[PDB]
Structures are given as structure tokens and as C-alpha cells.
RNA sequence: AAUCUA
């Protein structure tokens, strides 16, 4: 039991009790919250070849959750908030495991109690670093999370429910030794960037103090590692001969500015095709993986070598240049509002959709209900359809992805969403084409749907995404000298080092997502980031505000309406029918709901006029 | 763009500006109402043994404005209408696909607006055709598809949403070039053959426009077909090899009119086992599934030459013959209605329950998984259980042919379905044996059931199947020689060109379905084959009408009563309970459905008489 | 057609009208009650190296066949009764098929109809077994299936269900030829072991009366059965030659009473490595599985030996030995109750959550007639999450034996449950280790963690699983000598002929699971193994009293609290908002649950006194 | 998905 303070904050660190027959195992309690987290590696070699490794956080119980109707719905019983908080934790334990550990990992997270005070996502990540390290996986270093907020002026870290309710700064900060950080994830109230920098400052501060109070914990446990019977990277000989092979090739094709997308992943195709016939013959012993990740690592070092040397990209363009950017709005007359969001090869399209406020959060089933409230009343869907990408997938279900950037984009936009709004406000972004940041092209694009619907936010919001390309020496493992990408392409973020998504206003940030596939990054290198990105933000914002500036006077005269409709106490039984059989019959020919506000009058949501007009005509023949 | 012209209809074809990735892409447009398809084909060949074309049609309700209703405030499943009309996609585009195209193939269909009065439904089968066309994915000739309706006696193409509810006929054609006809689907208000067929013909003549419609726009974007690595087709002398292998072993299995269902495949199995063991001798080098298929492509060859030379079929009937029809009602006494049809080797039992009207208007707002009503109290669900066929399956959901089949078979009785009828109608049909056309005698079982439960239907309701057998000219592909068969076996399914399943009464047409194997069949070959069905239709039902011919005078004495209690208001607090908790717990464990009327008066709904008896019960005691 | 009296109740049997597609096929009715059962087995061997039969019992209506529910299928599935069922019908024909017939099976029921008195639970195990016995499928002896309850002190055979609502026992008996026993099933409201025992008795002799009414009509159809392509039983002469390599080494693992369940695990597989290189070179040409399997015969064979002969468990105890036992209660402050049981080296820690009456429902007609509502307002949810194995497994979802198994922990519990309980009662078991019963594991710590709640439980809850280790006669099939295990490990489980899963207070059974690996065995057996277990749960019921003898006095101080707000009726309109908008959103920001009592009236229930608070500031600001 | 050192 190692004890770690985090200024007034408290957090105990317990493990050998619980759950001792998995691999590693650990208990983290701060006040009355208690988390148990647990990791399993098998070990054998998985088939797939690449690192897999799965994060379940699950909630025992919201106030009481018992358990899902049936088998079916119980694989549905995955809540949104769930798969966020186990897409974070995924994010900061992923970078700090092994190359080429190709073997089935879960971690999984089972809340023991929870106060209502404390948050358990951010005990859940050091549960998962303290359960990795006392196990004998392989995991490089522990990792320490801290959530810091800004409530009236001061941070705080880990701060209570209440105290976030009132903050203007959701940060969460994961960060590994010697002063690096491995994640961050962040939602901000339209903040300064002054003021968001300085939180990463003090969170960083933080996590160092929990990787030394981890530290003890595992030198007084006795930790030992397993070796794993195989390490799956190419050997060094294999990969200098691929180097030798298609050094020239692969050059000439990144330097080849005339190619698109699909150009140029057909041109580096067509050179692997013939390294692989060649590299087998050479090395008929070699596995046939081996073949395949060589070229990958060759490739990979030719990309970022151009970059790293000449200072240009794939594309021709500089570190600070954006692709180019056309941004349509009112494409289609039915929809509320609609926009078509173009960047470079990625195409998104944005609709705007107004319904009831009663139709809009609230559930006729209470305990379903909780966690599916919204604030503002506002919510963004984010679909990634497979012909995105000329591809083909099942289009059953939200996957963890799609999840995962709906919540960002959503993040980005709710500073700007106006209260009291008289309707629910539901985005729904659809990727036509994928070439780069999706979801901060979904940013652009329902900020431009928002303003030709008509609803007055406060201010546009643009997102763009900073990649990274570092030089590594393996002697020290430090970062000599590094590039920053403006509005990185798809194949910069597969060969890069981090996909430092960042969003928001050209007067302040409202979301952040990075996104780091290195062992941790210095901390310059992140304020970097975001300086860089702010630049190419107002860019981006002065090519969006020629299509449109400023939200349109008024909602499309085809939107939705809300009246009220007088019904006497004489007919009420009639009119409501037996059990409200009528009203539950006219909501489903027509797509009006009516709700009942008094005992003599009726809220009646129209969707639309012609369905008004439908409606309308059913009151009137049963009045009679 | 390419604008074509049905009748006052106008039709808007684009493409080239949005999802510019897939392999092909589309918009329609007519009206306000856009929808965009994509066609998205593999280049490289899958590892089944056929075709995998998968059609996924998605409402994506924010198109028409009320997208969420559920607490996810996300579609979740797939609703009924969308699988229908991927099935009816399906039907229009797969007979054009070339043979031996064994590549995974998607099409899917994004809703980007829908105006609430141009069906999305048609614009997506047309979509699916353009985007075909201009993809490189090779199909064959552009495929027209309209909506025939009939409105005061006048047919009308593309009906709006208010005349498609004012329609005694609602047919939906696909037209291929030469005015042939690739998919037929439809389902009348008992209409006259006259009046039905002069609709299919008109609909012919406007899927032609469409055509050349296409055809402009395929000209003016230059159209170049891949080239597939290989098309999956035996070699042609493997197949006539097989053929003088197994020509007499078949012929003779084939003209034994003492085999059954099971007898028969047995003898053709054995025949298949002893042909592949001295193929693989012979071609060593041959694929395996070569092997296996040009038994298929020998078999039906042999099966479809004795009916075309002989006009004798597998079982001895000629081409008008029916096979064994035995009915048999009243199963069970405490079923309200209940029938058992046997047509030769299919059995099918059908059962009837009445249940309460609040039971029927389930919709998306109120149930996340089931949206809308039926017009008419009254649906019909269709099993297909495993051991029909001595075989094993899952039985869990997730079946679009049972969907499919239960819908064909709902629409046949639909028509004859009273109004007003006090309790909701619930038809379940099982397949126990499987031979044949067994959605068709769901809809004979069906209405034989209907009637044996009391309720007063119009009139009964036969359906029957008519296959077909065509000699196409080897290098023209004009069709020669047809024969028509009545109450095709399964076999004659699976070697025949089409499964013509038309059902309706005696006087006139309820429904019909067409699913055609070849790539388009001549407008004589189907209007043959109706008249051809009105023939049998009335000697089953002259069968059906000994075992029963009209409704029984009332319904069982064991089946549903509704009848109302009063409650004081004194007592109304501890009746209904906290928040409706005594109503609702007593109507879960005695089975009533409890519903208020007035301030005073409540609706029981009691399925059986028995359980009135328990609820009144409960009743007495609470009123104490 | 052959029908068969039970007492006042009368079984028809039929077959040969419906789905003669089928390998076999058949009709049981009862009263006015059809159950029809298909039985279908393919003719080619899986490559699943196990017998791979499903069950499956589907019915078309809720709430005794009056809630038409077969249309909500698509989208919402099979109910929890439907998988319990599934579940024993399962147990009463798996053990009787032959060994080595690793061949897809599918066993499925489709209630024709169903009356509302006769269950059709009952009629589905008979249907299996005719149409089992009529098929072509290799099959054992017919099984005759009876359900046993204690009304006003008689024993009823079948009993209809409005007798099973005032019957103090609910217990299936699924018996074999010889009176031999296949599946026990039973929950009891605390009755006698000597009631108990008797009604056992009479169950089996029930179902000899349907065995015999079986082989009448099987004689008179005139079955044939298959002769199946290949039965994957080890060969005899691979099987000893394993034993000559593996006997010494197995036998010291066993013997050694140091080791732990990895520890042992990882020595016998430590051995089967070994033995499994050598057994290739000796055989090159068999079947790689057969070479697995041959080793499984010879470790199983080892491990019954040193029962048998020396009357000596594997970990050092005896016979009648149990495991160490720990248990603790009160280690987190906001659960409303918890504790951790610990049995030898399995762990289960246990919540109570108190929640409102009100949540039981599910706020839609069919979908609470489906799921059904507890009588007791008392349910048990019970996971076994992969890391209890160190395994990796899909965490989402509840598999078959997890549902059985939170259904038998809570047919245990049920009986001590007290009545006109203020606050729904959810009992959360969850195996952080399994080495054991982890179930019956989850009844001990259950019950530990309703007294710590300070639910007023009538007497305190343990459970034990008897093992079973028998010498039967190579071709006799007698059972020549047997012995019974207390608290069976894993592998003792696994290499045991029975698992005998048996629950109750200090005066009483109150829940039996009785699965059973062999062809049936004699109800001396039986009845030996509830006297057994009756020792057992003494010596742990002391234990449990020790950590906490009774209920504490009342509820933790942060627990749920009902209250009640009275508003006017001009501020009734804005309190509830539009169409209930503000109760809703009261309830989605703080989690109190607000329903309305009369005109006047709401009642509050909040889980904690924080939530009343903030809540009750809600309530009076909107007024 | 069933069975499964649960």
C-alpha cells in the first residue's frame, strides 16, 4: 500500500488481494472510489499480425444498473461513456509496450465502489499502468494520469464532480518518466491558449509524482518480466538489403508531387509487389510476416527522411501549408441545414437536424435514460461509411472509432452551441471521402451546417491536425531534431509519430485529442504543436467565413414548429384516446408529437409544415 | 447530368462530386428527395464459392427530420422497410452480373435528403444502376425501375406518397434493354388480371426512358470495365466430360416418379460423388470447385432437357399439374384459430392470435427496436425453422429471407382483411417441411386459419409458384423455347430461370414476386406465366373451400374479451399504484392489459377468458 | 400413439404427422398443452473435437402463453427462462449419448400450444427424449422426465401451475432405465432433508412409467439407428501405452500436496508435452487429437486411482475435508452491503444495492411479461469475468452458464429473503478467482453481504459442491464402489463423474443443482451426497457466523431514503414540465427517481441522502 | 453461439 499526494488530493495504491490469479492486478482508491484493474497476456503468439490489445471499463452500476434484458442487447449494453474512458486508457498504456509484441492482451477495469465524487477514468488509467507494471507483461515504465480543471482562475487536479461542473477546463494528462507525455485529451470552454499551455505545465508535475509513488510500490513488490518466446521485428540484416532494394524507388515516388491518394498508395504498392518476390528468394527461411513488416519499416524511414532533410513533403508542400479548402452550405431545400466540407481529398458532409426538446434526451424507459442526457440539448453523430475509403465493411452498429470521433468533433462545437435553444440540435457528419482528419474536418463542416441553419453560435470553429516526424537515435532514445506537419495527409499520419488533433475558435481552444504512437514527447514539442496549429486554425477560419460568416437571420421556413393546441376537459378522452392510443397512433402516420403541458392544452412539435399540415387535419376530423 | 422525363415526373442523374473514392457513385434526384449510391467491388477474388453481393439500404431518418428517438438517439438495428427494399435492390441488379464474378461486392445507399412526397425506395434502385455503370465493376446493361399505381382508374408513374395511399396497386418494375424484365414486385388491392397486367406493360415502356437515360449519361463520362483476374466458370470440355460421364445416370434418376424430396437428392448425390473422384483422375490440375461445378452446370442441364424435350417433369406431373393440397383445420383447442396446409412435400401450420390494439402501434418512439404501425390491425410472422430442411442453424434473428417471406405472404392476405376489427391479428406461420413454395401456402394456410379463428375475411386467399425453363440461343441469348411450370418442387427452383410466386382470390390479384435467375425474360413470358397461375390458383382453392368456406359464426369460446371496470377516484391511488406500478405488475403476471378510458373507466383486455377471471380477481381485492 | 399415466395426470405421445423431414420428430401433449421436439444430427463428423449439441427451447408467448412475443424476436432474442430450460434439457440427454460422437446436434422445441395449466418446461425434456428415441441418432435409453411439488404435505407429479404457486418445492427429476438418475433440479422454501430425499424417490419412480410408455412406442415404429462414420474414442492400445509413460509421473503430481491450481496445472501439462512427443514417434499415423485425448483418459484415470485406493484428494485433505474458508464483510464504505468469501482458492466478492420498487418494471407491456417480475423484488447477477482464469475472453454479454449459475445462487437465497422489503434487493456476485464452486460460493458470500446491507434475512445461506469418483465394470456398467468428495476442486470437478451443487440454511435445502457426467447413477448415490453436503454446510455456516451471525440492526447511513414532496396543483404544470420533462431531467442529473403517488403527491427515492438534498433544492426552487 | 479444470 503506497500512498501518492497530489496536493489536497489523496491517492492509495493496493495490490496481492484481489484477484490473484491474473497477471497483474491493483486496487487504486481515492476517497471512497475504489478501482480494481487487471491485465492478461497470453503466451502465445496471436495469429493477427500486430499488437493486440483490448481495454474493457465497465460500470457496475449507475445508481442501480443491474443488467441488460437480453444476450443480445447485453453486447449493446456498452455505454458511450464506457467506450470513451477505455479508448483513453487504451491510448496511454498502447505507446509504452514492446515492438513487436504480438500477443492477446486485455485489461480490464471493474469499478469496486464508487462515491460520487471522485472520478474513476482517471483512477483507471494508473490502475492500468499499476496492474502492467507489478505484472510480469512487458511494459516499458509506469505511467501516471492526472484530470486538471480550471475553477475561477485556479487549477485543481482531479477535481470532484462538483468542482467540474464548474470548470472551464477538462484536461487529462497521462504522462511517462522523465518528463514526458504519452496522452492528452482535453475539452475547453473556449479558453486562452496561454491559459491551456500552463495546464499542461501542472499536470505534467503531477504524473511524475505518480510514476515515483508507482515506482516504490513495484521495487517493494519484487517485480519480475517474462520473456517472450519471440519479439516479431524484422531482423536488421532483412531490412538494410530491403533499404538497398527500393531506397531509390520509394524516393522518387515521395517526391513525385503529382500524385493523389490512391496514386501514390498504388505506387508504393507496385514497388513492394516486386521487393516481396525478390527479398523471398534472398531469404527463403524467413517468416512471411518478416517480408511484409521489412518493406514497411523501409518505407516508412524514406518517408520521413525527405521530410526531416529537404523540408517538403510527399505533396510538395512545407510544414506550415494547408491542403486546399471549399466549403458549400443549403446544397439540399429539405434539410434544416446542410453544409459540404472539403480539405485536400477529404470530403465530409454536414447536416443540421432540429427536433423536440422532449424527443431529443428524454427516454420513455428512466433507467435507460441515464447517461443519454445532453446539456445543451445538442448532439453530433459521426458516420465513417465504408466506401470512405473504396472499402467494405459491415454498416451495423457505431464501431469504438466512430464513437471515439463523434465525441471529439461534439467536444469542439459545444462551447459554441447557444443555451436555451428552443429545439434539440443533432449534427450528424457523414466522411464521403477519407484522406486526413475526418473529424476535424466534421468540425469545419458542422460549424458551417450550424450557421446556414440558422442557429446563432457564437463563433466558427475550425479543427486541424499536427502531425510530428522525429530522428531517434536507438543508442540514447532521445529526440535530436523533429518537423512539425500542418493538416497532415493520411499516409503522414500512418508514418508519423503523432496525430495531434486540435480544434477551435480563432480566439481560444475548445478541444484536443493527441494522439502519440512515440514512447512519450517532450513538453516543447507540445506547445509547438498547438502554436503551429493556431496559425493554420485562422487560416482555415478566413476561408470558411467567405462562404459564410455570420448564421442566417432566421431557421429555413421549412423547419420545424412548436404551437399549442386548446383541448377541453369534455374531450380529452377522446382526443388522448384509451391509454393514449390516438396520440401514440398520430405520432407514427405523422411525424408530429404532441405533449401534454395542462390539463386543457397540448404542445404540439411539427417537423415540418406539410407534416403540420397532416396533423392539423387529425385534430380537426376527431374534434368534429 | 443527365435529366430524364416520366411522364410529369422528372428524374435528375449526377455524379462526380461526392464520394469520389468509391469505385462507382451516383445521385437521383426527383424533387427534393436526393439519394446517393455506391458501388464498391474487390479486386481481388473472394474466398467463396459464389457471388457475395451484399445491398444495404439505410433510411438515415435525419433526412426527413426526426432522426433520434431512441435513449442512444442513434438508429440502432435495421428496420423491416429497409430490409425489404435491399431485397428488392438485390433482385434488380444481381441477374446482370456476369457468371463466375465471384468478387465481394457492396452497394449501399445514403438518404442525403428526403422531401416526404418522392419515394427514396425507386431512386435507390435506379442509383444502384447508374452507380454500377459508370463504376468499372463489370454488370450489365442499365437497369430502369418505376412505380406503377393505379388512382381512379388511371396508372401513374412514380406516385407520391399521397396518391401511393389512395392506390389499389402498388407494382414496382425493373426494366432491363429490349423491354425485358428483371424484377417484378408487387402487391394489389385484389385487382382484375386486365387491369394488372396493361400496368406491367406500361411500366415497361418507362423503365426504357430511364435506359436511355443512363446510356446518355455513360457516353458523356467515358465508362472503361475492369478486368476481373478470372471469371469462375467450368471449362467447357470439364463440363463435356462430366456430361458423358453422368448424362444416363441422371436422365434416369430424373424420369423416376417414385422418388421424394429426400430420395431424390440422395440418387443425384450419390451419382455426384462416384463423377468427382474420376474428374479429379482426369484433371488433376483442375480447380476443386471446377470440379464441383460442372457437375451443377451437367446436372441441370440433364434436368432442364427433360421438361423442354418432353414436357415431363422430375415427378411425373405435366406442366399444369399440382401437387397433393390436404387441409386441416382446428389443431388445438385453446389456439383461436389454426390450420395445418400440406402441398405435396411442404408443410406449413398456421396459427391465429388475437391480441389488444395497444399491442400494435410499437414504433420507434416508444420501442427503440420496432418502428410503425400497420395500416390494418393485422401482420404476419413467417418462420423457417432448421429441421424443415434436416438441417442445423442458428435461431437467433438477423434472417432477411424470413423477413422477406413474411412480408410476401402478409401482402397476399392483406387485402382481404376486415377493418375495424376489434383486436389486433397476429398470423404466425411455421414452416415444418420445406419441398416447395412454402411462403405461398403460408398465405393458403393463412386465410384457412384466418377463417377457422372467426374472422370475417372477404374471401380466401391461394398462392402458388410458377417456374420456368427456357433454351437460350448459345450466342444470341434470345429466348427460343419456354415451358411454364405450376407448383414447382425445390429442385425445379434451383434449376429453373425464375420462382414466380403470385397469389390472390379466385376473382382477382393480391400480391405477386417474381424472382428471375436469367438477365431479363420477355413481357409475353410473364404474362403467361399469370395466366397460367390464375388457372391453378382456383383449383386450390376449390380444395381449400371443402375443408372450410366461410368464417366460423363467432369466434372460440376461449379466445380474447374486452370489457371495461369502473374505479372511484378514492380508489383510483391505490389501483394504478406509484407511478403506475399496480397496473403495471398485476398486467405482467396475470397477462391483461390494463388501459384508462375515462376518469373513471379502465379497458381489460383479457386473452383468454380464464385470465379475465384472475384479473378480476385482483381487481376485487384492490377495490377493497 | 402411446399415452402414459401419472396419477391423476395423463402424458400423450405421438409422432409421424409433423416435420417428417427431421431424423426424428414428436408430440407430447399434456391437457390441452402441445410441446413438439425435432431432433437433427449431421452424418458428417465436426472438427470441433467435442460432442457439439445445442439446445434450443423457444415459446411464442409470455406469461403462461398469454403475451404474444415470437414477432419481438428479431430484435430482442431469447428470454432468460428460455436458456434456463435449454439448459435442462441439455443435462437430461448430453450424458447419454455415446462417447466419441463429436457430430453437430441440434435439439429443438416449438410449443404448438400451450393452456396455462400444464408447463411445458416438463413436456419439452419428454418431447427430446421420444424424439431422441424414435431418430436414427445414436441414443442411450429414453429418459423420463417429472416435476415434483409439496402441496399441503402431498407430492404431486406434474403439478399444474396454480398448484406450483402454493407448493413448497419445485423440484425436475430426469431419470434413466433402472431407475437410475441423469438431472436433478430443484428450489425448495427451506424444507426438511427428509422431505426432501422422499420426493426424490417418488420422481423416479414416475419417470420409469414414461420410460416404459417410450419403449412401447419405439417398439412399435420400429427404429433403426445410423451407423456413424467414425466414433472418436481413443484407441485402447494408444490409451495404454499412455498410461506406461505417464502412470509414475501423474501420480506424484497428484500426490504432491504442495501444489496450488497453476502450479498443478502447469506440471501436468509439463508432463502431457512430454508424453504427447513420444506418443507420435510411437504412432506417426494417428489422429493428432487422439493423441491429446489419449492423455486425458490416462491423467483422469490416475487422478480416480488415488481417490479410490487411498481415499486421499489430490491437495492432501479427506473425504469429508472442506477448504479453508475466509470471509469478510464492510470493506467499502458507499456499498450499501458487501463481502468477500474466500474457499480455498476461489474468491467472490458480493454487492447489495438497494434500489426503488419501481425499477423491476420495465416500463413496456412485453418486454416485462418477457423478462417477468421478481416475486420478492430480490434478483442475483452473477459474472465470472476471464480474468477469475487468467484467460481472455469477451467481457460483454452473458454466456449460458452464467446465467444458470446467478439462477441457482439466487433459488438459494430466495427462501431467507424477507417480505414487503422497502427497496428492490440486487445481489452482485463476482468471481475475481475460480478454483471451485464459484457459484455456491456466491450463495455463502451473498448471504454475508444481506446481513452486512442489514437486510433482515430469516437464517444465513451456505452451499457445497459433492463430487463423485466411481469403479464401474467395463461392460457390466454397475457401479462397483464410489466415493464423495466435499467442496470439489476444479480438476476434481473436471475429472468427476458429478457435480452435486447443493444449498440451504441450517434447517433446510433450499436450492439443488445435481450435474450429472454418467449415464445416470443409483439413488443410494444420490441420497448419500444430500446427507454429505448437510455435514459440510454445517461446518461452514459456522464460519460465516463467526465473521457476522445476524443482520446488522439497520441499513448503512448512506443508503437509499423514500421521501415525499407535496405540491400544489398550479405548480403542478411547471413542476413536471412538458410531457414529464423536468422529472426526467431531475432524474438523468441526479439519479432520483420521482413518481407520482396521487393529484398531490410524488414520491422521491433517492440512493444516497446527498442526492435527497440536492434533489429536495431542486424541487423547492422549481416551486 | 452450445459444451467446456466454471
Known sequence: AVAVDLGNRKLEISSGKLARFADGSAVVQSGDTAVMVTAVSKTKPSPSQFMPLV???????????????????????????????????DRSIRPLFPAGYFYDTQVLCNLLAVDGVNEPDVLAINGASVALSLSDIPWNGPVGAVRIGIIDGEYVVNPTRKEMS?????????????????????????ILQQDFCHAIKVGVKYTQQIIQGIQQLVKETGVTKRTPQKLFTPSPEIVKYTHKLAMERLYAVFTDYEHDKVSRDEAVNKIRLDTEEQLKEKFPEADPYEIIESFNVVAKEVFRSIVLNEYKRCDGRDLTSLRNVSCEVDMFKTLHGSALFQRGQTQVLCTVTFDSLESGIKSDQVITAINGIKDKNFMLHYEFPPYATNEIGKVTGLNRRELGHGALAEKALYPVI???????????????????????????????????SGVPISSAVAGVAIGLV???????????????????????????????????????????????????????????????????????????????????????????????????????????????????????????????????????????????????????EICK
Open 166 to 190: 464548474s470548470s472551464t477546463l477538462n484536461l487529462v494528462v497521462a504522462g511517462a518518466p522523465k518528463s514526458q507525455i504519452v496522452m492528452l485529451e482535453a475539452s475547453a470552454e473556449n
Open 55 to 89: 481495454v474493457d471499463y465497465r460500470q457496475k452500476a449507475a445508481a442501480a444498473g443491474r443488467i441488460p434484458t437480453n444476450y443480445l442487447r447485453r453486447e449493446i449494453g456498452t455505454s458511450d461513456k464506457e467506450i470513451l474512458t477505455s479508448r483513453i486508457i
Open 418 to 452: 447557444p443555451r436555451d435553444f428552443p429545439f434539440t440540435i443533432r449534427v450528424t457528419s457523414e466522411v464521403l471521402e477519407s484522406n486526413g482528419s475526418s473529424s476535424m474536418a466534421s468540425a469545419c463542416g458542422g460549424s458551417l451546417a450550424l450557421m446556414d
Open 470 to 620: 522525429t530522428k531517434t537515435d536507438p543508442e540514447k532514445g532521445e529526440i535530436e531534431d523533429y518537423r512539425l506537419l500542418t493538416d497532415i495527409l493520411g499516409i503522414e499520419d500512418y508514418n508519423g509519430d503523432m496525430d495531434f488533433k486540435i480544434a477551435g475558435t480563432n480566439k481560444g481552444i475548445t478541444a484536443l485529442q493527441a494522439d502519440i504512437k512515440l514512447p512519450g514527447i517532450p513538453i516543447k514539442i507540445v506547445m509547438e504543436a498547438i502554436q503551429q496549429a493556431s496559425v493554420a486554425k485562422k487560416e482555415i477560419l478566413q476561408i470558411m467565413n467567405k462562404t459564410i460568416s455570420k448564421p442566417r437571420a432566421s431557421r429555413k421556413e421549412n423547419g420545424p414548429v412548436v404551437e399549442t393546441v386548446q383541448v377541453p376537459l369534455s374531450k380529452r378522452a377522446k382526443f388522448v384516446g384509451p391509454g393514449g392510443y390516438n396520440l401514440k397512433k398520430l405520432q407514427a402516420e405523422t411525424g408530429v408529437t404532441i405533449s401534454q403541458v395542462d390539463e386543457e392544452t397540448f404542445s404540439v412539435f411539427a417537423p415540418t409544415p406539410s407534416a403540420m399540415h397532416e396533423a392539423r387535419d387529425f385534430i380537426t
